[PDB]
């Protein structure tokens, strides 16, 4: 079956409800005070985290070397709690997957799991007129209110939900190297 | 943890989407062509089952010996497929339970699981101004669109979702004896 136990361990220790000018989103915390949220959430200088106003210390809207949208924004937050480090659960590479679960943590749905079946490395996507790269796709009618939802298989956190058309859903991939302690150049 | 595998086996083989004048509802099929749906769905002479118009051969709105609403309606349907017999998964008696899952099968959510935690045998409920008896309660903000949702623990199907107030949800109980091959008197 689907790895429900695993999806639930991730939801329990590594998600929070985030609210921007654009609405609420499931937010996956990845390692220290660093989390992700779909770029189309429009993150500013402050963000509500479980209804608490929180300073956004850094926000990086990921684009690839063709300068195309990846629909991931990595945010660094001013909070007291660290997130459990889940970088080892992240895929090294692009892949296809079986039997994924999509999980949501919003005010409307504080704890909710949807098997979306099989996940295909889909690539290009015209996401609401923004060209976007590196999308995962599943044949499940995902809805508004699920963006930022965490897509897992057992032992792997593979993406966050960002789009759908009524019959498929789309997640932006997560890769391990998005989050590695690195080198120093001007990013804004 | 919660019995997700089990909730999913019930959703797979024993649920259908039912549409009445009142909207869509998760519908638990119990044994032959016999299913349940919340009384407030207002079942008539026909019902849509996975969008197919279906004759309702019999509908019993359960009330108890105080003549109070139980919010269960047992329906007998004109369909070709039998439902897998799940009467042995039904509780004999009123009880409290741990770590239940609420599952939903609608057009909006064809396959969806929510851990609602602990389930208490709650009793009386003023359900939208209808006095109702024999209600199960869980501390989880359930929403419209979840009515008829199936509440399980591992190995037991204990109720169907019927109400909530923004902080708790309420299910009407299912008991084994609701569904036993019986004696003959005029029920309408
Ligand atoms: C999550 C964000 C939200 O709830 O509202 C915006 C504040 C939401 C989830 C999807 C909506 C419907 N199904 C979903 O799973 N995502 C979006 O709305 C996308 C834009 C976005 C806004 C904010 C944050 C992140 C992303 N847009 C789409 O998903 C878009 C939906 O457009 C309509 C026309 C279907 C409503 N989908 C899309 O453009 O896919 C293109 C496509 C592909 C293949 C065939 C036909 C069309
Ligand atoms: C499912 C039916 C539906 O979606 O709409 C009607 C066609 C729905 C699910 C609940 C709605 C909000 N939360 C839920 O989990 N159930 C209902 O709407 C109930 C009536 C019903 C209609 C059709 C079929 C089955 C049942 N009504 C309620 O749940 C009611 C909600 O009323 C408001 C005022 C909160 C909107 N709840 C209620 O009356 O509880 C009383 C209470 C108890 C303790 C403290 C305060 C109030």
Q: What is the least distance, in Å, from the CA of B121 to any CA of chain A?
A: 23
Pairing mode, strands A52-63 and B130-138: unpaired
| Measured distance CA(B125)–CA(B71) in Å, rounded | 11
Q: Which class for B21: exposed (0-12), middle (13-18), buried (19 or more C-beta within 10 A)?
A: exposed
Say yes or no for a CB contact (<8 Å) between A5 and B1: yes
A:B CB pairs within 8 Å: 43
Contacts of A54 (CB under 8 A, 6+ apart): A46, A47, A48, A77, A78, A79
Which has the closest alpha carbon to B157: B1, B3, B19?
B3
Q: Which of the residues A24, A133, A147, A161 is marked catalytic?
A: A147
Out of 2.40.10.10, 3.40.50.970, 3.40.190.10, 2.40.50.140, select the CATH number for domain B1-14+84-188. 2.40.10.10
**Is the Cβ atom of A115 under 6 angstroms away from ligand 1?**
no
Q: How many CB atoms lie within 10 A of CB B116?
A: 24
Cα-trace Rg, chain A: 15
Resolution of this entry in Å? 2.5
Method by which the model was determined: X-ray
| Measured distance CA(B100)–CA(B7) in Å, rounded | 9
Say yes or no for a CB contact (<8 Å) between A112 and B113: yes
Whole-angstrom CA distances from B76 to A173, A180, B63 are 47, 60, 17
Tokens at residue A64, please? Answer: 């690839």
DSSP state of A178: G
Q: Indicate if B53 belongs to the active site.
A: no
Q: Indicate if A147 belongs to the active site.
A: yes
* Strand, helix or coil for residue A183: coil
Say yes or no for a CB contact (<8 Å) between A114 and B115: no
Q: What does CATH list as the number for B15-83?
A: 2.40.10.10
Q: How many CB atoms lie within 10 A of CB A186?
A: 4
Instruction: Give percent helix, percent strand, percent coil of chain B, each to the nearest 5.
Output: 10, 50, 40
Which has the closest alpha carbon to B119: B145, B104, B101, B103?
B101
**Is the Cβ atom of A47 under 6 angstroms away from ligand 1?**
no
Give the Cα-Cα-Cα angle A145, A147, A150 (nearest 5 degrees): 115
Whole-angstrom CA distances from A119 to A9, A58, A110, A136, A142 are 21, 31, 24, 6, 13
| Measured distance CA(B18)–CA(B32) in Å, rounded | 16
Question: Domain boundaries in chain A?
Answer: 1-14+84-188, 15-83
Q: Indicate if A40 belongs to the active site.
A: yes
Farthest CA pair distance, chain B:
45
Whether the Cβ atoms of residue A51 and residue A17 lie closer than 8 Å to each other: yes
Contacts of A39 (CB under 8 A, 6+ apart): A61, A62, A69, A70, A71, A72, A73
């Amino acid at each position: 079956g689907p790895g429900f136990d695993f999806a639930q361990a991730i939801m329990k220790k590594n998600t929070v409800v985030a609210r921007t000018e654009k609405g609420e989103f499931t937010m996956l915390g990845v390692h220290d005070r660093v989390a992700v949220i779909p770029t189309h959430a429009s993150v500013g200088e402050t963000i509500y985290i479980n209804d608490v106003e929180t300073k956004v210390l850094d926000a990086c809207a990921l684009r690839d070397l063709t300068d195309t949208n990846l629909e991931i924004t990595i945010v660094k937050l001013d909070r007291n709690q660290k997130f459990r480090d889940i970088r080892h659960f992240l895929p090294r590479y692009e892949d296809d997957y079986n039997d994924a679960v999509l999980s949501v943590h919003t005010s409307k749905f504080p704890n909710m799991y949807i098997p979306v079946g099989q996940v295909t490395n889909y690539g290009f996507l015209n996401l609401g007129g923004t060209p976007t790269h590196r999308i995962l796709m599943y044949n499940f009618p995902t809805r508004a209110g699920q963006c930022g939802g965490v897509v897992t298989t057992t032992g792997k956190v593979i993406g966050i939900h960002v789009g759908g058309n009524g019959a498929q859903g789309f997640a932006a991939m997560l890769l391990h190297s998005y989050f590695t302690d690195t080198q120093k150049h001007h990013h804004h």
